[PDB]
Amino acid sequence: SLTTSHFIPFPREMVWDWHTRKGAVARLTPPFIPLNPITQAERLADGTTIFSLPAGLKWVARHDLSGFLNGSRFTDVCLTAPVKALANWRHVHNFVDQDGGTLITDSVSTRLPASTLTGMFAYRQTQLIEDLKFLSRTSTLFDGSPLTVAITGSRGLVGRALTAQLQTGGHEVIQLVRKEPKPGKRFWDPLNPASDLLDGADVLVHLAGEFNDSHKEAIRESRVLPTKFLAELVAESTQCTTMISASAVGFYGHDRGDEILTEESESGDDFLAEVCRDWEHATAPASDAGKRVAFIRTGVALSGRGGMLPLLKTLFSGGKFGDGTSWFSWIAIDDLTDIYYRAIVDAQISGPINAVAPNPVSNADMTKILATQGAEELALASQRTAPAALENLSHTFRYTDIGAAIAHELGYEQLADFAQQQEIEANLEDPEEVEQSILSSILNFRRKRNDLEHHH
C-alpha cells in the first residue's frame, strides 16, 4: 500500500522512547480523520489499542509480536473490519540510525491507494518532528525533571492534546474530571472542590470550560467561582507552585478595530471583557499566596478535530462578512498546547500571555484561504492581537502563517519524500515483500543524502 521514510534529527534511543510513552498514539493520530484512541496499549510489542470511529463504531488495533524488535521496530495490525478501508491493515514502523539521528520507515500493507495515505503520513511525520523539536527547545528552560500536573478540562479539545503532550514528555498528569473518573483520575466538583484535590501536584492547569449580560450568573457559577476555589487550593498547597489558568483575547473586548493588542493593552469595554477580567481576578488567592500565576489569553484555536476550524471549513459548502476587515485572532492548536506546556515548566512565564499566532488575518483573507454553530458570527469579533510577551522571550511558533496551520490540521501536507509525493500524483504486500520495500526505502533515502553531500 505505502512505504515511505523520513529523517528525525534526534537519537534513535530518544525517538523510540517517545513512541513507548502514554500519549504517543494520540499525538500522531491525524485530526482530519475521525479516529480517536480511547485506550492506551501498555507496550509496543503486543497489546491492543481501541479507537473510536464515527457512528458508535470502534477499531481494535493490535501490536504484532512477530513484527517487534526492541528499539528498532513495532507493527500495528487489524484483523476485523469495522469498515473496509480500515481493515486488513498492517503498519510496520521501522527505526534505524542515520548520521546520529533517526530514519523512520513506515510500511503499511492495505488495499487503499497510496494517494489515500499521503495526508495521514505527512501529519505523522511533521507532528513527530515538531513535537521532538519542541521538547528539545523546552529542555533549555528548566531542569528537565518530570513534574506532576493537575489538569481540569483534560477531556476537552485543548486539554486532551496537552495531556498527551505532557505524557510524551515524561511528566505525570492528574486529570481532575467532572464525571466518570477512571483510576488515577480525581473527581472535581467545581463549586465544592475536595480539600485534597491537588495533592501530589507541582502545577495546576485550569482549562475547564467551553455574549449578553443575561448570561452573568451562569458564567459566574461555571467560570468565576470554580476558578477561585481552585486558586484557594493552590494557595493552601505547599507543593503546588504554579497556576496556569485559561483566559481569552476576549479580555480586550470583542472589537478593538485596528489597534494592535498586547499584554500591555487595557481590558475591553463590553461584557465579554468584564467576564474575562473577573475570570482572571478569581486567581488572586494563588498569586496573593506567592504562587506563580499566568493567564493564557487564547485566540481561536485551529484544530482539524473540533472547534471552529471544521465548522468554518464546512461553511464553504459562507463568504466574507460585511467589510471583511474584521481581525481574526487565531492560533494553531499545537502552538496553544506548546504555550501551556512552556508555561508549566518555564518560571519566566507569569501574568497575562497572549496565546495567538504572530499573524492575525482579516476576515476577507481567512475566507480566501479556506477555499485555496457560532462560526458564522466569528467575524463579529475583531481582535488584532500580538503575542508580544512570547516574542520578547524569543518563543518559536510551529505555525506563524494560517495557511500552514490549516494545511497541517486538515491534512494537506506532503510526504517528507518530496519526489515520492510527486510520483504518487501520477495491492497488499506479504512479509518478504515488506522487508524488501523497507530496505529499498532506506537505500533510496541514503542514496539521495549521499548525492546531496557530494553536491557541496
Side-chain angles (χ1 to χ4, degrees), residues 152-163 175 207-209 305 333:
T152 69
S154 69
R155 293 172 173 173
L157 225 205
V158 173
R160 201 168 173 188
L162 176 59
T163 292
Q175 294 174 243
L207 276 181
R305 55 168 65 89
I333 184 166

Side-chain angles (χ1 to χ4, degrees), residues 33-83:
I33 299 182
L35 197 66
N36 292 109
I38 52 184
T39 77
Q40 180 72 242
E42 179 181 309
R43 290 141 44 217
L44 299 182
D46 53 18
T48 99
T49 299
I50 313 287
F51 292 80
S52 62
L53 275 163
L57 293 181
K58 294 183 192 191
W59 184 44
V60 179
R62 209 174 146 272
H63 287 140
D64 183 358
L65 209 213
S66 76
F68 178 77
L69 181 49
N70 192 212
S72 298
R73 182 178 290 185
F74 72 91
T75 298
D76 306 316
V77 303
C78 181
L79 68 83
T80 42
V83 303

Side-chain angles (χ1 to χ4, degrees), residues 191 215-227 278:
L191 293 171
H215 281 77
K216 214 213 180 64
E217 188 50 20
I219 286 160
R220 205 181 146 265
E221 306 178 2
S222 62
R223 238 151 203 16
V224 174
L225 256 27
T227 293
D278 292 348

Side-chain angles (χ1 to χ4, degrees), residues 7 19 40 87 100 104 113 157 159 165 215 221 228 232 234 238 240 260 288 308 339 351 355 365 398 409 442:
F7 177 73
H19 288 79
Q40 180 72 242
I104 296 173
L157 225 205
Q165 197 178 358
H215 281 77
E221 306 178 2
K228 187 183 172 183
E232 291 174 356
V234 171
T238 38
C240 199
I260 290 176
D288 288 344
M308 291 307 117
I339 289 163
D365 282 336
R398 295 193 194 199
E409 290 299 324
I442 288 169

Side-chain angles (χ1 to χ4, degrees), residues 134 137 330-341 355-358 390 395-401 405:
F134 167 77
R137 295 191 297 271
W330 65 275
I331 185 168
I333 184 166
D334 291 316
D335 280 309
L336 177 58
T337 63
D338 280 2
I339 289 163
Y340 272 102
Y341 193 131
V356 301
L390 290 170
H395 186 76
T396 294
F397 288 87
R398 295 193 194 199
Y399 308 100
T400 54
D401 313 312

Side-chain angles (χ1 to χ4, degrees), residues 94-106:
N94 197 257
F95 301 78
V96 294
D97 295 318
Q98 185 63 48
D99 300 322
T102 304
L103 176 64
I104 296 173
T105 304
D106 293 287

